[PDB]
Nucleic acid binder design. Structure first.
Ligand SMILES: C[C@@H]1CCO[C@H]2Cn3cc(C(=O)NCc4ccc(F)cc4F)c(=O)c(O)c3C(=O)N12
Ligand SMILES: C[C@@H]1CCO[C@H]2Cn3cc(C(=O)NCc4ccc(F)cc4F)c(=O)c(O)c3C(=O)N12
Ligand SMILES: [Mg+2]
Ligand SMILES: [Mg+2]
Ligand SMILES: [Mg+2]
Ligand SMILES: [Mg+2]
Ligand SMILES: [Zn+2]
Ligand SMILES: [Zn+2]
Lengths: 66, 261, 47, 237, 261, 47, 66, 237
DNA sequence: CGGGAAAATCTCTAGCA
DNA sequence: ACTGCTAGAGATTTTCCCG
DNA sequence: CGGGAAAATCTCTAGCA
DNA sequence: ACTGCTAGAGATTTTCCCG
């Protein structure tokens, strides 16, 4: 049910940048996806990233690797 | 510093010495010397040393024209993935651009196009094409190519590949399509070690899937959260922190001093 | 308020002071002698 | 790791595939592929005619997604260029043509050789009918037939929701290609691991299935046995 | 990988896929995929991402010409200090350059001049001027301005100052000399917070003083040092390490396993 | 030995392979078809 | 005598760069000055720097500050 | 810190200056300046004549270092341009001219006002004689008199070693200007510190001399007393 | 030992054309 | 065998001042 | 726990014209 | 009210493999 859905959302990865660092910050965990912002979880930490700074993939290689 | 300040402004009108030279030569604290510099219109000659960041939402495409062997190559890139669409067009005109764009909108989901201010892109016919397809147009600041940085870099990459495979074709149109193939499917790197084709598939598939998933979650998970305020809708809870939305302002407040109803 | 000095639109000469209307990340909107301009923050200085 | 037996029992009862067995019971997909083990690149081409012009139409058969355009003439070169464009835009493994002169020319064959497309000489007809219907609905919103053709392609790919799950052809083709990428990645993982030989506790040669961070899954005598990493010695044969 | 290697070279001849795409699509270790890339002449299109470093010895001067309002400004910079010498010259000719250079050699110690390959600098008359003054000429790699980076940056700085003080003069020659004044004495920064004039004075004074000092030290302190070898002349000793010179090779060996005689 | 590929002297086309004669910091001396060239290391690749 | 001379040499400062870092390394201590190289002492450490990478000043501001 | 009394005794015996007292006895130079306390910018200009041309010659009187060149004509503008060049190349505080028309023009005065040079209207003559002697020795190595003038300037500034320490004019001028920079820096330090007032152990107002890292030097009743930092309270008056 | 405020240091950009 | 740099704007980190 | 070797990551450049 | 980026070459750091 709702737990399965939430874990599914949490399988997706988020690459993101901060407002002054041009390096794309490595794969984080997707907690919530909105119209204007996504809420991620990067190394025991909950950031709010705007949508225009966020690349959300599933990464099929890692999904198939388990 | 009253005496020193008057001598330093007299000297700055002639020489425009920087703040250190004034602070040194007239006994002034750095803040006063810097103020004398900052009051001179003639010494404001340098911008702040940073770079902005272009929009990378799933629906943004950056368009540009480029030129090779006398022909005009119209290039689009999907910003999130690096996936390119390119065609040799007969001239740099709004009619060919509107056609390229309407094709692109029929091929992939396009929400926004981002171009420089070339006449082909600001044409009324391109505007009518965007209005029919539901595409929002965004025009960069004039003469700031850094704003189109993604597509300009894709220009460089596409020309490099065309130069690698030019001898395998006759007409430039064929070599361009070969290079688009090579970029989209035969070069892997970036975030998920993907090719651009794989990556765009993943980006768009993820967009659709997450959209549906969160639709179902919000449809099920309905609660209200108080913290410190009012009935702030709940987004996510877990690991000692709660994510909530109070008047379109998403804030992460810890579990303590936050109750869910 | 703020004084804005800027270099715009291929002219390598620096203009200003102008009034600041909006400050984003990467760009500002200035008001110089009734003209609204949009300038990258690489090409402006806000005082 | 512990739900492997549950997965085997589920496959014996219901014959579920590896996707459900790996998503419900939490298994590295190579494990589910072993349990179960113990199109997306096919396009249909065809030229069609309208207002005296030729409309070359490509159909991804698994999704119903269309790529159509007006070409100047029905020659080999034009078809081959359309094919290079299609292949550079999508994963194209196989094309289904109708023995027409353009579809058999030396140039189209050379382009399929360059792109690595296989050529093999009903859905195309019905899809052409749908395309001509939309082209008729929107011919008045445009002057040239090429613009109307692209408008119709847009309407068909993104504005016509049908099928079971109420999707457009674009959503469907994206889903199908994503599935195919998953398939290719799983096959690469299997091909990687299939060259290893394992010796555990020391028993006979066993086949490696996964080298997790806390366990090692193998398969001996058609039996999937989980053992620690220190208790097993992986080699390469 | 015998099967995989043959398919990957066949595919690379057509597409020129990078090493990752091959490693992924044909089961190859990264080293073999990278070798296939590194064997293709057609894929060698990028240099190593570094920058060299220009010589900054006390005697090196970097010369260049620059252009403003239709006139030719000949600019020299002392590399160690940032001190500039600039004159408006009537044309970009070897005769005016030899004269500027011979003046400079009479004003300051010049050992080496470093220029691009403009005709004024490679002229025979400049060569005769350098030979009379004892100046060694070093010519950068052609069309590599980064080699003249110091003087090119000084061009930018001098033009900026000229633009600040242009209205205080009539002829460009006067504004150029004013800007040279302003750069040499009214702008402080760099290593010792100095101006360029102070800094060049310090650099040259230090050169002379250290030369004499070490002359006297080596004249007094005469010993021989064995370590591990032969009679290696002693340079410096202290703090548990000894500095020595064994066959023009200066090595810092600790006090242990090193005896002074 | 070494293969050297280089871009020289304003020609944006990359040439080579050439033989490496000397390797400094910042520059190399190559031998391409009897010609000695001097190239910045930003503009060469040594294999 | 010789001790005074050596301390005098050691009053001079050396700014220097390493073969791949473009930042000029901060004020170090001059131990020896040769034709081809100078021997410095930077933060309890003895480096040998080539002359073309070494700016040697006395820095009169610090000398006057004591 | 402990050699301050030694410095006072040395100044009483020998009247040494602050340089020796600060280098031998290890004192922050403001301390030695207090003990002792209890030209380098002057240039001579003059036009000279040769082969019909005018040679404008500047002499740094303290060192004997020459800046000479052929000018087209003896006008104010030419002299003023020579002066702007000299001032941008060297620290020029004062120029000593000979009331000639060029040396008194409104343009030369405006240039001295811009550069911050003071104008005041034997060594110049002797130096001109030396310059003409070298110009004669090297007139044959050149075609134009301007080249020979610059050759002679080079020979005079760097190839003629004389004086006590066997130096050239260039070495001398560099030494003298380095000394003057030291002087200016010491004066800036003194001006900085002269605005502070100190109270120590709490005694009366004392004058600050140094705020070292382990001690604080002050001067009370013409007596230089060293105290710890915690034992004193610096303020600003 | 503690913050605050000021200095020092570090990061990063355009223009040199 | 030769070689990017310089100075300023803003951000971040260290140092000094009085408790 | 220890090195070695291989992978991953980080740093940094030109060209986009 | 908008905004440098991308991919490759080489260097450095982390991870995995068998003892
Ligand atoms: C007439 C249209 C509209 C108005 O402006 C002009 C001129 N222009 C100039 C460049 C250019 O200078 N590229 C070099 C570059 C420099 C920095 C960077 F970050 C990216 C870069 F690509 C273009 O690429 C380009 O497309 C145009 C163009 O189209 N137009
Ligand atoms: C005919 C002579 C001899 C042969 O080459 C040409 C052409 N050239 C071109 C530039 C130039 O492109 N500057 C921009 C720049 C770019 C990068 C960088 F690191 C430094 C920079 F200054 C010059 O400055 C210059 O002096 C010349 C010149 O003199 N010549
Ligand atoms: Mg453009
Ligand atoms: Mg462009
Ligand atoms: Mg030049
Ligand atoms: Mg130049
Ligand atoms: Zn100013
Ligand atoms: Zn290749």
């Amino acid at each position: 049910e709702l737990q399965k859905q939430i874990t599914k959302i949490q399988n997706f990865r988020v690459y993101y940048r901060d407002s002054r660092d041009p390096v794309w910050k490595g794969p984080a965990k997707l907690l919530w996806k909105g119209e204007g912002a996504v809420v991620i979880q990067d190394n025991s930490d909950i950031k709010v990233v705007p949508r225009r700074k966020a690349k959300i993939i599933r990464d099929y290689g890692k999904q198939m690797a388990g | 510093f009253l005496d020193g300040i008057d001598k330093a402004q007299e000297e700055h009108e002639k020489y425009h010495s920087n703040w250190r030279a004034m602070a040194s030569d007239f006994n002034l604290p750095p803040v006063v010397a810097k103020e004398i510099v900052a009051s001179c219109d003639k010494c404001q000659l340098k911008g702040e040393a940073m770079h902005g960041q272009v929009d990378c939402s799933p629906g943004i495409w950056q368009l540009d024209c480029t030129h090779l062997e006398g022909k005009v190559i119209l290039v689009a890139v999907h910003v999130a993935s690096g996936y390119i669409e390119a065609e040799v067009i007969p001239a740099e005109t709004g009619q060919e651009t509107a056609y390229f764009l309407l094709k692109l909108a029929g091929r992939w989901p396009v929400k926004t196009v981002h171009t420089d201010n070339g006449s082909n892109f600001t044409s009324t016919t391109v505007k009518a094409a965007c209005w029919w397809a539901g595409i929002k147009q965004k025009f960069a600041i004039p003469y700031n190519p850094q704003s189109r940085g993604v597509i300009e870099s894709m220009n460089k990459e596409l020309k490099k590949i065309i130069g690698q495979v030019r001898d395998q074709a006759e007409h430039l149109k064929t070599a361009v399509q070969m290079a688009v193939f090579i970029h989209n499917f035969k070069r892997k790197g970036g975030i998920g070690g993907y090719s651009a084709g794989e990556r765009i598939v993943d980006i768009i598939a993820t967009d659709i899937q997450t959209k549906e998933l969160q639709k179902q979650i919000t449809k099920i998970q309905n609660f209200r959260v108080y913290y410190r305020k009012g009935p702030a809708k709940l987004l996510w809870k877990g690991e000692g922190a709660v994510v909530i939305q109070d008047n379109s302002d998403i804030k992460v407040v810890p579990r303590r001093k936050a109750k869910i109803i | 308020n703020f004084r804005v000095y800027y270099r715009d639109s291929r002219d390598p000469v620096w203009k200003g002071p102008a009034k600041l209307l909006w400050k984003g990340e990467g760009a500002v909107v200035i008001q110089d002698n009734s003209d609204i301009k949009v300038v990258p923050r690489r090409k402006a200085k806000i005082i």
